[PDB]
Amino acid sequence: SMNPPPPETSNPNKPKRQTNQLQYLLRVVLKTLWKHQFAWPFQQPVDAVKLNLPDYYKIIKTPMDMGTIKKRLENNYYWNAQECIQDFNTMFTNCYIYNKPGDDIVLMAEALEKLFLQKINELPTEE
Ligand SMILES: Cc1sc2c(c1C)C(c1ccc(Cl)cc1)=N[C@@H](CC(=O)NCCCCNC(=O)COc1cccc3c1C(=O)N([C@H]1CCC(=O)NC1=O)C3=O)c1nnc(C)n1-2
Numbered sequence: 001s002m003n004p005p006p007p008e009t010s011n012p013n014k015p016k017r018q019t020n021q022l023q024y025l026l027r028v029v030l031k032t033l034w035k036h037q038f039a040w041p042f043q044q045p046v047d048a049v050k051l052n053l054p055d056y057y058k059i060i061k062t063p064m065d066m067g068t069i070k071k072r073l074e075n076n077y078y079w080n081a082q083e084c085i086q087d088f089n090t091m092f093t094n095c096y097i098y099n100k101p102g103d104d105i106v107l108m109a110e111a112l113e114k115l116f117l118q119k120i121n122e123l124p125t126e127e
Pocket of ligand 1: 040041042046047051053095098099104105
């Protein structure tokens with residue numbers, strides 16, 4: 001079995017910015033979620049080989065995880081905050097699609113998403 005390559009984190013042709021909103025997404029949002037007791041499954045791509053999930057990447061065709069998001073934020077991959085918010089949303093939705101309601105990992109993702117949304121409510125106005 002094999003894992004796919006990870007999502008892109010470097011592309012010199014993609015235009016970049018570091019807006020106050022993107023700074024907040026790293027400093028506050030990512031860093032707060034990262035330290036949560038339920039962060040660990042989401043801190044790196046799903047290793048479908050290690051976890052014996054041969055169907056994972058047959059079902060999940062837009063993989064995303066907080067390790068990738070952290071790299072994208074630290075390496076300024078984004079132009080805007082919405083791109084990053086979309087990555088978080090993709091991560092949560094993937095978990096809900098692959099797993100069943102009430103599964104432990106779904107409860108973990110839901111707790112992180114609740115926290116994420118709280119933090120997004122204080123996203124600063126773009127200066
Ligand atoms: C590092 C990561 S990343 C990650 C995860 C981890 C550990 C986790 C995860 C999970 C829990 C927590 Cl608290 C935290 C993280 N989750 C995975 C999903 C997962 O592992 N999904 C696995 C789901 C497996 C369930 N499926 C079965 O057990 C299928 O088994 C069946 C189903 C039907 C019939 C039979 C059998 C079976 O084994 N047998 C055997 C029995 C023995 C026998 O004699 N004969 C048989 O045929 C059946 O008859 C996941 N999804 N998103 C993320 C993120 N993750």
